[PDB]
Scaffold this active site. Sequence first.
Site, short mmCIF file in Angstrom:
data_model
loop_
_atom_site.label_atom_id
_atom_site.label_comp_id
_atom_site.label_asym_id
_atom_site.label_seq_id
_atom_site.Cartn_x
_atom_site.Cartn_y
_atom_site.Cartn_z
N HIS A 145 0.85 -1.29 -0.07
CA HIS A 145 -0.06 0.14 0.02
C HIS A 145 0.86 1.32 -0.05
CE1 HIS A 145 -3.64 2.32 0.78
NE2 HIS A 145 -4.42 1.30 0.60
N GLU B 251 -1.73 -0.59 -6.26
CA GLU B 251 -1.97 -2.00 -5.48
C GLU B 251 -2.05 -2.84 -6.46
OE1 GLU B 251 -4.77 -1.14 -1.99
OE2 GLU B 251 -4.69 1.01 -2.88
C1 G6D Z 1 -9.04 1.19 -1.76
C2 G6D Z 1 -8.84 2.20 -0.54
O1 G6D Z 1 -10.22 2.34 -0.51
C3 G6D Z 1 -10.33 3.71 0.37
O2 G6D Z 1 -11.79 3.77 0.49
C4 G6D Z 1 -9.57 3.38 1.58
O3 G6D Z 1 -9.87 4.50 2.65
C5 G6D Z 1 -7.98 3.07 1.44
O4 G6D Z 1 -7.23 2.98 2.42
C6 G6D Z 1 -8.07 1.70 0.71
O5 G6D Z 1 -6.78 1.33 0.39
#
Ligand code: G6D
Lengths: 346, 339
Positions: free
Chosen positions: B169, B303
Amino acid sequence: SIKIRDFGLGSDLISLTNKAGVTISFTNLGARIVDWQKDGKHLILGFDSAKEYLEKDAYPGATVGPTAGRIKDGLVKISGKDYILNQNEGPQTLHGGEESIHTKLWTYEVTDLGAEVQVKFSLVSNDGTNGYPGKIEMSVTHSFDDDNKWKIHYEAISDKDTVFNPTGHVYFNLNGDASESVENHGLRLAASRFVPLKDQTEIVRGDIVDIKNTDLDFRQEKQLSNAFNSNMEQVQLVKGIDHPFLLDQLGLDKEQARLTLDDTSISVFTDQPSIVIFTANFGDLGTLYHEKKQVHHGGITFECQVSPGSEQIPELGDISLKAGEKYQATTIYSLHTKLEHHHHHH
Amino acid sequence: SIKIRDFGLGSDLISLTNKAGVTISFTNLGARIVDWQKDGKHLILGFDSAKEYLEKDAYPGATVGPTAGRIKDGLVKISGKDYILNQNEGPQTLHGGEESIHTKLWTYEVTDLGAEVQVKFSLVSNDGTNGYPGKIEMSVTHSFDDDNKWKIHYEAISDKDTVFNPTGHVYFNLNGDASESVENHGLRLAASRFVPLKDQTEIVRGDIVDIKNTDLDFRQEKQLSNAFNSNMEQVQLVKGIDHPFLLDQLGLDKEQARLTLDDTSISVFTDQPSIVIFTANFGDLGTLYHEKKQVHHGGITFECQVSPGSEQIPELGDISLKAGEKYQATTIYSLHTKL
Ligand SMILES: C[C@H]1O[C@@H](O)[C@H](O)[C@@H](O)[C@@H]1O
Ligand SMILES: C[C@H]1O[C@@H](O)[C@H](O)[C@@H](O)[C@@H]1O
Ligand code: NA
């Protein structure tokens, strides 16, 4: 004085020296005690690096749990519900299951109070980990002071009704050498009864037996050789001691046990109801400690906790922990010199 | 050179400096990337101590799992059986549940290969942890080389059939400052499809959408502002980007994405099929990074993993991990400087 250094694999070694010059050390790997020395002599068993713990024996000096000891068929009953925990010893759950708390890196913070230094280790057991309902937020505080008292304070809070009954797995050996049997130590223990094991699987038999006037009666100080040389069935079953002793009188205020060798004594205080004693009945295994091959009977534990087997012998107590209820436990090991006269020969 | 120091709470900070003078740092707290800097400039977001991560935001630069992303209702089917995982965001299971692997101290070992240095982080997820069958022995290896390549190699073995799909992340910000939006960066991304979200709960909507010729088409480099200024309902839904993009061609050799700012560029390589992009749509939150208040759009992630929502859209793939099977995954972040 406080010193910290890498201990291997990412763990740290925290070393404290009190005003008397006594030094004791811990690692966050299993919120464990690693060493305790007086005048250059080790009072306990420990290794020189983290890897040794992971490759030789991960229990020494560790914080073990969430439940210490064996749970027959890993079955517990929580609020009318049956739960099966991780079974890592045949069908038994031993010391919380596999890859338990003693194998994890706990986070920690050090508090210097001057005459006392506290090392507070923290860890969260997630809900369902090894079968245990949670999550459980745990903390173990090891502290050492100028009075040569090493204290262990446990605290825990669960999100769910669960079971909790941890202990400290230190092994003492006043000889300062694992290759020297503790049969030469004097033992005084305020317990009139014990919990026999069924058999080799080591689950409890089901009954509580009075040991007064037997080779296991230590109310009045005697050499450990008396127990080791015994042919009582229970001794023979385990090749030494590996049993829970029920304390006759409760309270942190009372000296429940005292282990002596010559001019040195270790006194044990706790607010728990039993002391589980295991005398390193490893036979010829010979695990190396500081390059010394450990002998059968080369160490002794004083695991203060609620006695294992309460699942079968309700009289032992109740280790349930209610959601939101705060668990607390305190155990103290205090070191003394010339407490009594102990001049013997083996 | 390698330097190891205390990072707080018992965690360690491992800093690697290659022949080029570039410095990359990790922490065993969550097998995570803390910093990445060149000529004194940070390329990614990160904090200055372990405590900050625990108190402000535990996700930045962390290894998240066992399953990265949102699982509708915390429900997974394993060998025909339903399993409910820890629910930490409403009824959803997000990033493996509460107090997950990103908040644990992993053990690690450093291996110096000269041109390459590797840091192997290990962790055992016990059977039953947050509802996941196991145990799962996991390892994440972060490496850095003289060619400015930061590589992530995951390995895992489970004692029982389970699910597994972790991700890294890290948040990039070529401005080297959180108070500055990444709207100015240029992005290229080799994906012609994306996975729309149902609503503000961010669970998948159910379908797969073609993005060719839309504000989300980055097959040709474009500036982020474009997306940011878009009126596409999906953009408006999250106020930025918070979606899985499906890669057109798979394989580690193909540059799947490229993030550029002036002379500096990061290329993304992976053996995974999707890239989840989140542009720190935090609004006024203002989390502090290096004393700088973070702005909405103050960072962007790449990611790489199997896209989330396979529980509802099977075509996305399958995250199961059968007992005894060895899971492997590789993701590479390559840094380039124009001359
Ligand atoms: C995919 C992402 O969605 C978001 O709403 C979250 O707050 C993030 O931390 C997450 O990694
Ligand atoms: C109390 C002791 O019982 C023994 O049989 C086990 O082998 C020890 O590791 C344990 O701690
Ligand atoms: Na450390």
